Amino acid sequence: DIIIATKNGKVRGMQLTVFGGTVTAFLGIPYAQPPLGRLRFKKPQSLTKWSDIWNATKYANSCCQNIDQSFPGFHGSEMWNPNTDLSEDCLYLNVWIPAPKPKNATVLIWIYGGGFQTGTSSLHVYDGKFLARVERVIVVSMNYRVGALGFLALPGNPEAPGNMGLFDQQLALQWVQKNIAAFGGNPKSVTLFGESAGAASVSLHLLSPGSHSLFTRAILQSGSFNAPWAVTSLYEARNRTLNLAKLTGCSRENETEIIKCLRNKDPQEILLNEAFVVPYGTPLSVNFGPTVDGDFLTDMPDILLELGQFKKTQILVGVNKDEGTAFLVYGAPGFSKDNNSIITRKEFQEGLKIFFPGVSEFGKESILFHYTDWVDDQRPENYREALGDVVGDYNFICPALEFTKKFSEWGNNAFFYYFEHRSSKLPWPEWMGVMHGYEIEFVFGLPLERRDQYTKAEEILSRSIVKRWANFAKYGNPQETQNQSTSWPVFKSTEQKYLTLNTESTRIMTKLRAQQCRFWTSFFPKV
């Protein structure tokens, strides 16, 4: 029976057996007033406090969200769907601590991705028990609001100010500051890590004055706020809020009246209308996401990045070799997870329409030109691979690299990785390669479980990643020092060294995607 006294009252955890040892799991601790009724669309409000013992022995409700129904029965898509009841009552967090209770352990705080429209902390591939067991760190993860319920913005209006889910994340960091010592944690040694939209969140906490003292350092897996899906302009955000009102029958003259009406809608009516607030979407559409609110974010984030206005600390940043491929089967013509998807030039052309719907003809021809100068054989997979690379380079890899250059130009140490191992168990087909999201199970140490059908080479690779992430969190330096590992150099503009993560041999390389990123970073923005 393990009971911890928190600031707001007692909580009871549960003991788990993990690799011949024990971890204590406190699952579903609340960290804010449930955001219901008059609190829908508002900043999270602080927790009242309880007497008696709160039982943190099961995962809580996931936040309301639309679900992926493109591949019913298929584990490759379905593993990302929520595995707890959906509810507006979802502001809870999880804590995994080593047993015996540690004395002053580093804390790793996970922020899930999902486009800021989806996601939940309770997914199997984010289970923190393995990290707590093996590295003796404490792992924390939180649910935060997503979609319109988390990001609806009528900027400047506190009834719906925008960025509510980012404030949810913030309030959970504050909970760790006030409470984690009771669990044997060091509030002075907190590292945020997150993937995709979770990585873009981590990058925005580096920018938010109110987050600066709530953590020590940051890890960004395939995401950063300068990615083109990551931040909505004030103009598109007001437009979206108003389109949502049109569709739900809540157009009014007074803006506060609009929100009042929106608070009477059932969550379903709101979720059903989210896809249509926009005239054309792509598979990467973020209809309701971070905005410049004058509160969480004081100015356009590209300006803060460029002018050095962010927390000074070390970062670890990385991407997967085939980021863009998972998205091609959610609308590009000629793609299928169930065949080899050899597409024509005409199909490639139509795919650019799917992925770059607002872009001029010239803009799209410039993409085709940069990506279809073949080298040179008449390989049939040319157009299929080019489309995946287009989508991965624009959306993930070039923004990650550019975030990393700009951040390290102000004097701090940065480490960059390129993940290139395809899981032996991936249910998606082979042409999709080393997909977006499929490093996460390596970072959380799932292949450390022998029962679990990963190869030996994969266990060893995961074990080494876990040690490098942990050494980064504790010490600021992602080395694996005992096993003659390749030493991981800092990423500097100029040399731009990065480390490859793979099962065969780990390499130091330079200037990842140099020709492609010159295209996306210096030319495409002008288009």
Ligand X SMILES: *[C@@H]1O[C@H](CO)[C@@H](O[C@@H]2O[C@H](CO)[C@@H](O)[C@H](O)[C@H]2NC(C)=O)[C@H](O)[C@H]1NC(C)=O
Ligand Y SMILES: *[C@@H]1O[C@H](CO)[C@@H](O)[C@H](O)[C@H]1NC(C)=O
Ligand Z SMILES: C[C@@H]1O[C@@H](O)[C@@H](O)[C@H](O)[C@@H]1O
Write out the E strands in 64-142: 92-99, 105-111, 138-142
Name the residue nearer to a copy of itself (CB basis): 22 or 502.
502
369 lines the binding site for ligand Z (CB under 6 A): no
- Give min distance, CB of 280 to ligand Z, in A: 8
Q: How far is the CB of 331 from ligand X (least distance, A)?
A: 9
Q: Which residue in 334, 388, 433, 476 binds ligand X (CB under 6 A)?
A: 334
**By the rule CB under 6 A, 246 interacts with ligand Z:** yes
Q: Which tokens sit at 463?
A: 């074990």
- Rule CB under 6 A: say whether 70 interacts with ligand X: no
Residue 323 appears among annotated catalytic residues: yes
Look at residue 246 and give the partner it binds from a copy of itself, ligand Z, Cl ion, none, a contact being a CB closer than 5 to 8 Å depending on partner kind.
ligand Z
Q: How far is the CB of 358 from ligand Z (least distance, A)?
A: 12
- 504 touching ligand Z, by CB under 6 A: no
31-39, 127-135, 334-342, 463-471 -> range binding ligand Z (CB under 6 A) = 334-342
Tell me, by CB under 6 A, how many residues bind ligand Z: 8
Q: Does 351 bind ligand X (CB under 6 A)?
A: no
334 interface partner picked from K ion, ligand X, a copy of itself, none, CB below 5 to 8 A per type: ligand X
**Residue 71 touching ligand X (CB under 6 A):** no
* Helix/strand/coil (H/E/C) assignment for every residue in 97-110: EEECCCCCEEEEEE
Q: Which of 141-149, 154-162, 328-336, 477-485 is the region at the interface with ligand Y (rule: CB under 6 A)?
A: 477-485
Tokens 């559409």 locate to 285
Asked if 339 interacts with ligand X (CB under 6 A), we say yes
Catalytic residue of the set 159, 420, 436, 462:
436
Q: Which residues on neighbouring strands pair with residue 16, listed in sequence order?
A: 23
What is d(CA 343, CA 328) in angstroms, rounded to the nearest whole number? 11
Pick out residues in 248-287 that bind ligand Y (CB under 6 A).
254, 256-257, 279
Residue 279 CB, nearest distance to ligand X (Å)? 22
- Mention every residue, 6+ apart, whose C-beta is less than 8 A from residue 171: 31, 32, 44, 46, 91
Q: What does the alpha-carbon distance between residue 224 and residue 194 come to, in Å, rounded to a whole number?
A: 10
Select from 213, 268, 510, 522 the one that contacts Cl ion (CB under 5 A): 510
User: Under a CB-based contact definition with an 8 Å cutoff, are residues 224 and 207 in contact?
Assistant: no
Catalytic pick among 196, 211, 341, 462: 196
Nearest CB to K ion, comparing residues 280 and 362:
362
**Binding site residue list for tacrine:** 80, 436
Q: Are strands 414-419 and 54-55 parallel, antiparallel or unpaired?
A: unpaired
Sheet holding 54-55, edge to edge: 3-5, 10-12, 54-55
Per-residue b or e along 12-32, where b marks 16 or more CB atoms closer than 10 Å to that residue's CB: ebeebebeeebbbbbbbbbbb
List binders of ligand Y among 37-56 (CB under 6 A): 55
% helix, strand, coil for the chain, step of 5: 35, 15, 45
16 phi and psi angles, rounded to 5 deg: -120, 145
Asked if 243 is part of the footprint of ligand Y (rule: CB under 6 A), the reply reads yes
Strands 21-30 and 92-99: antiparallel
Residues 6+ apart with CB under 8 A from 97: 13, 23, 24, 26, 105, 132, 138, 183, 184, 185
Order of all β-strands in the sheet with 105-111: 14-18, 21-30, 92-99, 138-142, 105-111, 185-195, 217-221, 315-320, 414-419, 497-501, 508-510
279 near ligand Z, rule: CB under 6 A: yes
Window contacting ligand Z (CB under 6 A); options: 125-133, 219-227, 243-251, 446-454: 243-251
Q: Residues annotated in the binding site, as ranges?
A: 80, 114-115, 436
Write b or e for each residue in 382-412: b if 16 or more Cβ atoms lie within 10 A of its Cβ, otherwise e.
Answer: bbbbbbbbbbbbbbbbbbbbbbbbbbbeeeb
| Contact call for residue 483 and ligand Y (CB under 6 A) | yes
Contact call for residue 494 and Cl ion (CB under 5 A)? no
Identity of the residue, 105 or 270, whose beta carbon is nearer to ligand Z in the bound complex: 270
Q: Nearest CA to 56 among 106, 6, 100?
A: 6
342 binds ligand Z, rule: CB under 6 A? no
**Cβ atoms within 10 Å, residue 504:** 10
Amino acid identity at 67 = I
Q: Which partner, K ion, ligand Z, ligand Y, none, binds residue 103 by CB below 5 to 8 Å per kind?
A: ligand Y
The answer to the question of residue 467 lying near ligand Y (CB under 6 A) is: yes
First-to-final CA distance of the chain = 62
Find the binder of ligand X among 340, 372, 494, 522 (CB under 6 A): 340
480 binds, among ligand Y, Cl ion, a copy of itself, none (CB under 5 to 8 A by kind): ligand Y
Token reading at 472: 């980064």
Number of other residues whose CB lies within 10 A of the CB of residue 93: 28
| CB nearer ligand Z, residue 30 or residue 388 | 388
Query: Residues within the annotated binding site for substrate?
Result: 114-115
Query: How far apart are CB 507 and Cl ion at their closest, in Å?
Result: 9
The residues that touch ligand Y, with contacts defined as CB under 6 A, are: 55, 103-104, 186, 188-189, 236, 239, 243, 254, 256-257, 279, 463-464, 467, 480, 482-483
The residues that touch ligand Z, with contacts defined as CB under 6 A, are: 243, 246-247, 276, 279, 336, 338-339
Residues involved in catalysis: 196, 323, 436
The residues that touch Cl ion, with contacts defined as CB under 5 A, are: 508, 510
The residues that touch K ion, with contacts defined as CB under 5 A, are: 523
